[PDB]
Structure formats: structure tokens, C-alpha cells
Design a protein around this ligand. Structure first.
Ligand SMILES: CNc1nc2c(CCNC[C@H]3CC[C@H](C#Cc4cccnc4)CC3)c3nc(N)[nH]c(=O)c3cc2[nH]1
Ligand SMILES: CNc1nc2c(CCNC[C@H]3CC[C@H](C#Cc4cccnc4)CC3)c3nc(N)[nH]c(=O)c3cc2[nH]1
Ligand SMILES: [Zn+2]
Ligand SMILES: [Zn+2]
Lengths: 342, 342
């Protein structure tokens, strides 16, 4: 396989399905990328840089070996999480374009994200523009850092991240800057930051067509099953979200009939599996009643079973999306999905 | 298979190895019986009677179906746990011989324990004798209750529980009472209650030979790997203990070189598996360093991996014990084990 090759096998409206070929594997698109701790998983740059440290991970052989995962790994650039959990033209103290790229190289990830500024919401036009301008300067710095490390330039891929808040002209300027620099793929940043789905979809409507059509489009931090379906309708190819994982440990299971909270007493005698159609290993062997029982008793096994189911549900959703676009039936699927989920 | 048949295939000193045949399966002895939530697992009578209730479990099809486990299940009679976590000749208010047997029938377990009084330690001779006498009266009541329920009498087995604290004459009187009643197997109760290993072994030395030789001997609540090896040397065939499960969720892993606390910083860069020889799935794929990383991050996956390893370690210990007795090499094994573990 090549370092990076994206091929679109089929289209329906703005929705696409295809494959990214990389040296460690093929990624079928549209793709859901779960956290590692699926064709590609997400590493946690912010956590790892603090514990055990990027250098320590490199000493242990890089994240593939550490985690026992030999397929592609995507890493975020770290500043989203810095801003959220912990500033100058050089970067952030609490990380810079150059240090972020270096950390991601030490971790050994296959898809590397440019170091950006996820503009808070709401933002005024002026503020959105200053922030986006800084991110575009950081995007060029990220490009140059990545290109300067041969092992990285030759074996990994670099994605640029569009900013501009909710403003069409700033999103256009950002898309133009990123395409002039040139990246392997393009993320839509600055969303899923409290603006709500209608506004997110409005911004995606004009923002995704500004990105190069022939490269993958990644919507960062999205999301709920319905967010994902609507984003695919708008031209998005890749997704990451902690919802499946966090939901799992909180008693929430995803089903084709919507999310359920398994701790509710209504499940104490329910002998159905978490979802009726789900092909996952949990749904093959255990009832809602037993998983309810485990979670209420504080058993670790319960939360593990829930998480496994939720990650499998999300991959079943992406498979159904891929097959439906390939078959010219995605419009119908989305409408069928929505009808039942809500 | 028959309702209950114990066959001794090989002996070495007081140690035995063999099989219990029951309708739902064969149990190889000496056996470790982990908590269900291995050839046999333990159900949690005390928890289940409170949530969701024995009747509710019966309504859901019994514990085999509930848990998705079609092999034998052993249940304790509930009063140990009542005494520990929450009194008259009739029973305890907070359970009686009759109610305990009924609960175990509703749960559907295959090996049913008599309802006893686990005498606190230390106990004076007088107190130990009064308590043991009451337990023997309750043992006869437990026998009669079990025999009165046809589905239970015909498909399950009933074990009697020897008491007497640390006193030889009371242990003898208890053994005599239980054998006069008649049971399918015999447990040594009243130990692992704070007396320490030397005292436990001293009591086992005279107590196990008082029990019928041709029936299984169960030491309740034991224990650490070295406790198990020494008890087998003294004629014990069956074990249960929450240590593997609790240790798992607390950062403690069992290894042939002794227990380790994986959270210790000394493991942060250790690329060895939890144990070098262990055949378990965790030890096949992941390092001490990664499990350390997961547990320190509070990931559920870490505690699950630890627990899986510990349950597998205990089953590997019992397999080695079985094979060594069968081969006439258990004395050597025990000495080799001890040398390395400590
Ligand atoms: C939830 N909303 C959302 N997240 C965004 C991210 C981060 C994407 N997810 C990274 C994961 C988060 C969980 C971690 C764990 C365990 C692993 C990394 C972004 N990252 C960037 N760089 N820019 C955006 O504008 C950006 C915008 C985002 N919006
Ligand atoms: C730890 N020491 C120990 N335990 C004893 C028990 C209980 C055996 N284990 C039952 C398990 C405990 C964990 C539960 C969970 C999850 C599942 C049941 C006993 N039960 C009896 N009846 N009598 C004794 O003298 C008796 C003596 C015991 N000593
Ligand atoms: Zn499922
Ligand atoms: Zn192991």
C-alpha cells in the first residue's frame, strides 16, 4: 500500500463512500474512529504527553506496539484538549505547531493533525477571524514541521483543520489557505462546541464544499448517531467521539430505537438483548436484565459489556452507511434511521 | 451423567485428584470456583436474594439462563455474608435452613450448601460448642428441606458444613453428626476468619481426616495461592475466594513469582507480560507497562484485563496441582511453587 491514497467508490448527493489506503491498512469511509483504550483508532495525545510522556512512549516502541494495535492510528494535535481541560503566536503554555508534530511523530501515529486553535463558541466576527488567521499560520508551520521529519513525511499523513466559527467568508478564507498549503485530508474544526445540531448542519452546508473534493473530510468530535448521519449527508468522511465510550461507563446504551439508560428499573426483567438487531458479542449472549444487574451491583463486567456494545453499534452504523451509499439507498436509509431512532 | 458422582483418580499423601460428575458437567478436582460475575462458578446468594430477589431470578429462568452459564453453579447458604455484611434457633433476621434451601432452589444452583453459623474467631470452647451444636441441628433441617423438593433432590447436590472452631473434639463431633445425616460432600467451615495460615493448617490437619474419605472436601473462602496448595496437601478438593476478582480491581496481579501491584511506577516501562509463563489472553497480547498505564488512567479496560489474568492464573494453578497429583509429583510441585512464589 501507498503512504496515502483516498479513492471514492460511490456517491449519493454530497455523501461519499470509499477507502483510504495507508501502509498499515485500509480505512473504509465513512469511518468511525474509536478511542483505542474499527479500521483506525484514536490515540490520546494530551494524556500521553503527560503520562508517560511522548519520549517514554517512543522508548517503549511507539503507540502501535504499546497498545498492541498494528493498524492505523490518528492523533489530535493536543490543543483542543489543553484548552478544554487545563497563549501567544508561538503556541500555548499550560505546545506549538512544531512540538505538537514532534509529539505525534514520537507516538508514531499514521494520521497527524495540524496544531490549531478551536475557536470558542460564540465568537464575534473579529475574534473568529483573528483566531482563524492564527490557525492558518500554525497550519503552515505544522506542514513545514511534518515535512522536515523524513520518517513522518514518508509514512504518515497530515490533515489541515478549517476554522472560521460559523462565518461563511471566514470558512472560505480558511479553506483557501489550507488548500494553498496542501494537505492529505481536511478536517472541519471549530464545531461541536455548543452551537447545537441545526447550526452545525448550517455551517457544514457551506463549509464542506469549500474543501477539496478529492480528499477526505473529517468532522472532529462528532458525535451522536444522528449527527453522524447528517454530516455524511453533507460530505463528511471521518468521525471521532468519546460518546460511545463514556456512555458505556454511565449506563447509556445506543440502540436503533435510540439511547436507553440500562440502570432504569424498567430493564430489571427485560430478557431482550441491548439491541434486537445488533450482531455484537454481548447482544449474542446476554440480556438487558443481566447487564442492568451487573451495572447496579457496580460490577466492572457490566460497564465493559456496555462499552463493547456501544463501540459495535457505532461500527454497525458506519457499515450501514457505507453499504447504503454504495447501493444508491443512503437517502432512504437516513430517513428510515431517523424515523426509528427518534 | 448422574446427579452426583465423585471419583478419585489419583492420590499423593492426603492430596487427591479426580472428578465430580453432575448433570450439567464434570468438575475436575482440586477445583477453584470463581465468582460468576472454570468448571463451576459461584453464585452470590446474599446479593441475589436482595437484588433482584430469588423469586425474580426464578421468573427470569434461574441463574444459569440469567448469567448465560450452562455449567454447574455452587451457591453458599447466605448466612456467612449476612453475619459479615449486615439470631435464634429458627435462623437469622436482618434466613433459616428452610428459607436458605428454598432460595438456592429458586436460583437453580447445582451444589447447595447447608445453612450454618460461621463461628467467630476467637471463640471459647463453650461458645464454639453451642454454635457447632446449633449448626448441626440446622444441617439436619437443611437436609430435610432439600430432600422435600423433588427437582432439587433429583438434580442438585447438598453439602454439609463442619464447624467446631479450632477444637479437635468439637470438629470430631461435628464430622460425626454430618456423616450420620449424610451429605454429597463436606465443607470445612469456620476457617479463614482471621486465625492465620498456621492455625488454619493445624486445624485442617486433624479436621479433614474426620470427614468421609470418599466424598469431596470443600474449604470455604480459601484463598491465597499458597493457602490453596497447603490445603490440597491436607486433603481439600474444592476452593472459592474473592481474592482474584477483588485483587484485580485493586491493581494486584498474581504471578508465579508472587503478587505484584501493577500501579507501582516500577512497571511503567516493563514490557514483560503480567506473568512470563501464563497462557492467558492478556499475557498473550499486552505488557505490564500498558496495563499499568490503563489502570493509572482509571480505564475500565485495565481492571478487566487484570481480573481476567488473575482468574486465569488461579485456573492454571489448579491445573498444575491436578497434573502433579496425577503424576505422583505434587510434593515436589508444592515445594517448587513455594520456593518461587515467596
Ligand atoms: C466534542 N467536540 C469537538 N471535539 C473537537 C476536537 C477534538 C476531537 N477529538 C479528539 C479526541 C478527544 C477524546 C480523547 C480521549 C480519550 C482522544 C482525542 C477538535 N480538535 C482540534 N484539533 N480542533 C478542533 O477544532 C476540534 C473541535 C472539536 N470539537
Ligand atoms: C473468607 N473466609 C471465609 N468465607 C467463608 C464462607 C463463605 C464462602 N464464600 C462465599 C462467596 C463469598 C463472595 C460472594 C461474592 C461475590 C459469593 C459467595 C463460609 N460460608 C459458610 N456458609 N460457612 C462458613 O463457615 C464459611 C466460612 C468462610 N470463611
Ligand atoms: Zn450489541
Ligand atoms: Zn496472564
Amino acid at each position: 500500500r501507498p503512504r496515502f491514497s483516498f479513492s471514492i467508490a460511490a456517491r449519493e448527493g454530497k455523501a461519499r463512500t470509499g477507502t483510504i489506503e495507508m501502509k498499515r491498512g485500509v480505512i473504509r469511509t465513512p469511518a468511525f474512529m474509536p478511542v483505542g483504550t474499527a479500521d483506525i483508532i484514536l490515540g490520546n495525545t494530551y494524556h500521553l504527553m503527560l503520562r508517560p510522556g511522548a519520549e517514554r512512549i517512543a522508548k517503549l516502541g511507539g503507540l502501535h506496539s504499546f497498545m498492541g494495535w498494528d493498524r492505523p492510528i490518528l492523533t489530535d494535535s493536543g490543543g483542543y484538549q489543553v484548552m478544554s481541560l487545563s497563549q501567544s503566536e508561538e503556541g500555548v503554555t499550560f505546545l506549538s505547531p512544531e512540538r505538537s508534530i514532534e509529539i505525534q511523530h514520537l507516538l508514531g501515529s499514521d494520521i497527524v493533525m495540524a496544531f490549531d486553535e478551536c475557536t470558542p463558541y460564540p465568537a464575534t466576527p473579529s475574534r473568529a477571524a483573528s483566531s482563524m488567521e492564527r490557525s492558518m499560520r500554525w497550519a503552515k508551520r505544522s506542514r513545514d514541521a511534518f515535512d522536515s521529519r523524513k520518517e513522518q513525511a514518508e509514512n504518515a499523513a497530515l490533515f489541515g483543520i478549517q476554522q472560521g466559527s460559523v462565518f461563511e467568508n471566514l470558512r472560505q478564507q480558511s479553506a483557501d489557505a489550507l488548500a494553498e498549503i496542501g494537505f492529505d485530508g481536511y478536517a472541519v474544526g471549530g464545531l461541536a462546541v455548543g452551537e447545537g445540531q441545526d447550526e452545525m448542519f448550517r455551517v457544514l452546508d457551506f463549509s464542506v464544499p469549500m474543501l477539496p473534493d478529492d480528499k477526505p473530510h473529517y468532522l472532529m468530535g462528532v458525535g451522536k448517531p444522528d449527527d453522524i448521519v447528517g454530516a455524511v449527508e453533507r460530505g463528511i468522511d471521518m468521525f471521532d467521539c468519546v460518546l460511545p465510550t463514556r456512555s458505556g461507563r454511565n449506563g447509556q446504551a445506543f440502540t436503533w430505537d435510540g439511547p436507553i439508560n440500562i440502570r432504569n428499573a424498567r430493564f430489571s426483567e427485560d430478557l431482550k438483548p441491548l439491541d434486537s438487531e445488533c450482531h455484537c458479542a454481548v447482544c449474542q449472549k446476554w440480556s438487558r436484565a443481566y447487564i442492568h444487574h451487573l451495572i447496579r451491583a457496580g460490577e466492572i463486567l457490566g460497564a465493559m459489556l456496555m462499552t463493547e456494545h456501544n463501540i459495535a453499534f457505532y461500527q454497525q452504523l458506519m457499515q450501514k452507511i457505507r453499504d447504503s451509499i454504495s447501493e444508491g439507498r443512503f437517502s432512504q436509509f437516513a430517513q428510515d434511521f431517523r424515523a426509528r431512532y427518534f
